[PDB]
Amino acid sequence: APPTLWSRVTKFGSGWGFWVSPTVFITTTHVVPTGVKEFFGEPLSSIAIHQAGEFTQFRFSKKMRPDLTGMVLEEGCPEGTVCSVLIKRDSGELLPLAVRMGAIASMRIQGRLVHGQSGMLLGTIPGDCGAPYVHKRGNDWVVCGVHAAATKSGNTVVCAVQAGEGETALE
Contact residues: Cl ion, CB under 5 A: 6-7
Taking CB under 8 A as the rule, does residue 78 contact its own copies?
Answer: yes
CB of 14 to its own copies, least distance (A): 20
Taking CB under 8 A as the rule, does residue 36 contact its own copies?
Answer: no
| Per-residue three-class SS string for 119-161 | EEECCCCHHHCCCEEEEEECCEEEEEEEEEEECCCCCEEEEEC
Taking CB under 5 A as the rule, does residue 102 contact Mg ion?
Answer: yes
- Cα 107 from Cα 115, distance rounded (Å): 6
Q: Which residues contact 171 (CB under 8 A, 6 or more apart)?
A: 165
Taking CB under 8 A as the rule, does residue 52 contact its own copies?
Answer: no
CB of 119 to Mg ion, least distance (A): 5
- Cα 98 from Cα 87, distance rounded (Å): 11
Nearest residue relative to Cl ion (C-beta): 7
Show the beta-strand stretches assigned E in 55-139: 55-60, 72-73, 82-88, 94-109, 112-121, 132-137
Q: How many CB atoms lie within 10 A of CB 128?
A: 22
CB of 136 to Cl ion, least distance (A): 18
Taking CB under 5 A as the rule, does residue 103 contact Mg ion?
Answer: yes
142 makes contact, choosing from Mg ion, its own copies, Cl ion, none, with CB < 5 to 8 Å by partner type, with: none
Taking CB under 8 A as the rule, does residue 156 contact its own copies?
Answer: yes
Residues that bind its own copies (CB under 8 A): 78-80, 100, 102-110, 113, 118-120, 149, 151-156, 158, 167-171
